[PDB]
Design a protein around this ligand. Structure first.
Ligand SMILES: Nc1nc2c(ncn2[C@@H]2O[C@H](COP(=O)(O)OP(=O)(O)CP(=O)(O)O)[C@@H](O)[C@H]2O)c(=O)[nH]1
Ligand code: MET
Lengths: 23, 470
RNA sequence: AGCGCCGUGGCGCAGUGGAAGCGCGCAGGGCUCAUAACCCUGAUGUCCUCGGAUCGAAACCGAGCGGCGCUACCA
């Protein structure tokens, strides 16, 4: 299964969006 | 107002420091989870595998914090020949209030027993769950014996797939298949490039990789998103490694053997030789317990050619002056770890790529070198690691007698010549001597497109041997 | 990290043993009706940092600076 991979995916994209909104 | 070094030394003292391993532990009562074992020696070996120009030193550095040299001033950026090693200690907080995804951490080899919590808001202290070593396999087509040597030393796998490039990467598949040859189904998939992808593209890559692995042997390999530049979600990597990867059965009833793959002498240049050290060979333990002050023998030894041309292999017997396991010089060696075994041998033996993929043994044991051997082999249908641009990925051709085939016995790089081929068995003559002890699973590589390509697995059944010469 | 080398006047090489060296430069002048060619005269620095010998050192030696070629990433 690959479902519990998307949770870390969303966590990491939240981290990136908090870090560098310029991109 | 103390400086950084004083604060870190105070934490080191408060964290327990680095304990010294007692000389004579009660061996029959110790497990790889024991405090005496978990504090200074590696217990689980893990390797990083991926395509070329993807980054395996960077992800390992982010996980652990120990850099890989990637030496020779030209191999610094393209590819590496030797092993890129690093040490990681995986910790979990002892408090229940901490977040489980984030409580996991990894630290350098010089870390103390119990470092303080680096998460702002919790007064707990970390605990070393299990000790692991990380090895950097070279991901290029010209270097294939090194990857199989890594598979021999590896017990766990970390595949790396980038996003913006082609989703079905052939080198990643070839590494995965070669690891499956080594009977290793505990694999973890990682996505190297995540930041530059959009919301939909990451899921598209996830589905493409899911389609990539449906018919292969791998069943439950997790998929993990990580970035090598921001140094985040390394706790996820440690979590997945700890949860999914168990400790292979390895205890004291098995006979001591070691598999040496690297070579690093100790010779400080300019310093007077009166203050020196012997030659050190880098090898891993796959069975047996070793101690400081034993006698070892490299059985392939000095390979001399006589006037006729026959191979005289003189075993190199030597006394072990030091045993090193990833932090310090220790006494007793636990099965399943990388160690630089240092002896009184001449420094010429441990400078260059000479002890690459060979076996060594302690006294009271006589392994056998071989000249003609019988091997049972099988192939696959499609070639892996090749890029056929939309036209029928090439199928393996049947072996031909008197053809130079690179028969990598686990890690030993030997060039065999076929003397006979049948339905599923072959007979090979070896120029470079190769030892065989029990099973020593084998990989086979051939040459058609100017390079070395893996074709299938192999297992030794019989062979003509040469008893060592005194 | 080991040693071989280098340390301009701007670039490239030499002299090392009596204190400012050349070709290339750059400025000014000369020949030419005119230009290049050719001929003159120059003003640019710690011949890498710090000491010993000596009337004398940049040179010889010594107690470290940055980069270069092999050895090699030397637990
Ligand atoms: N933007 C980005 N760059 C990465 C990422 N991972 C690695 N890189 C970069 O790839 C480049 C490759 O350098 P390096 O990792 O040292 O080479 P190597 O991985 O050891 C060679 P091989 O893969 O064959 O072992 C590095 O500059 C690294 O920063 C990533 O996830 N994102
Ligand atoms: C070749 S032994 C494995 C690496 C060595 N322990 C360092 O650290």
């Amino acid at each position: 299964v690959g479902l519990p991979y998307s949770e870390l995916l969303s966590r990491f994209f939240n981290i990136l969006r908090t870090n560098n909104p310029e991109l | 107002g103390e400086t950084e070094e004083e604060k870190r030394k105070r934490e080191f003292e408060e964290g327990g420091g680095l304990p010294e391993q007692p000389l004579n532990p009660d061996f029959s009562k110790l497990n790889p989870l024991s405090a005496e074992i978990i504090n200074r020696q590696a217990t689980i070996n893990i390797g990083t595998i991926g395509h070329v120009a993807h980054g395996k030193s960077t992800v390992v550095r982010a996980i652990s914090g120990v850099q890989t040299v990637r030496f020779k001033d030209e191999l610094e950026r393209n590819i590496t020949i030797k092993l890129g090693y690093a040490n990681a200690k995986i910790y979990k907080c002892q408090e229940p209030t901490c977040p489980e995804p984030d409580c996991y951490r990894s630290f350098k080899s010089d870390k103390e027993i119990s470092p303080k919590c680096q998460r702002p808001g919790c007064p707990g202290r970390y605990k070393l769950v299990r000790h692991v070593s990380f090895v950097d396999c070279p991901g290029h087509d010209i270097l294939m014996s090194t990857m199989l040597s890594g598979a021999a030393v590896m017990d766990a796998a970390l595949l790396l797939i980038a996003g913006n490039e082609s989703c079905p990467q052939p080198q990643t598949s070839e590494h995965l298949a070669a690891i499956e040859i080594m009977k290793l189904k505990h694999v973890i998939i990682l996505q190297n490039k995540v930041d530059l992808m959009r919301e939909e593209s990451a899921l598209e890559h996830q589905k493409s990789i899911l389609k990539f692995i449906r018919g292969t042997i791998a069943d439950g390999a997790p998929i993990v998103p990580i970035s090598a530049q921001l140094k985040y979600n390394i706790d996820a990597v440690n979590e997945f490694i700890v949860k999914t990867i168990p400790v292979p059965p390895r205890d004291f009833m098995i006979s001591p053997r070691l598999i040496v793959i690297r070579s690093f002498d100790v010779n400080k240049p300019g310093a007077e030789i009166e203050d020196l050290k012997g030659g050190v060979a880098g090898g891993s333990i796959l069975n047996g317990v070793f101690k400081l002050g034993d006698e070892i023998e490299i059985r392939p030894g000095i390979v001399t050619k006589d006037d006729k041309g026959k191979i005289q292999c003189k075993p190199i017997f030597s006394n072990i002056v030091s045993l090193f396991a990833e932090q310090n010089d220790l006494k007793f060696a636990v099965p399943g770890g990388l160690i630089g075994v240092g002896t009184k041998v001449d420094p010429t033996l441990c400078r260059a790529d000479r002890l690459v993929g060979q076996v060594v043994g302690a006294k009271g044991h006589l392994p056998n070198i071989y000249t003609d051997i019988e091997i049972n082999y099988f192939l696959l249908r499609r070639l892996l690691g090749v890029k056929t641009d939309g036209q029928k990925q090439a199928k393996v051709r049947k072996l031909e007698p008197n053809e130079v085939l690179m028969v990598n016995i686990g890690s030993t790089a030997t060039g065999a010549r076929v003397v006979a081929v049948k339905a599923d068995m072959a007979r090979l003559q070896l120029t470079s001597p190769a030892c065989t002890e029990i099973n020593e699973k084998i990989a086979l590589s051939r040459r058609i497109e100017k390079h070395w390509r893996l074709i299938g697995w192999a297992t030794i059944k019989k062979g003509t041997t040469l008893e060592p010469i005194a």
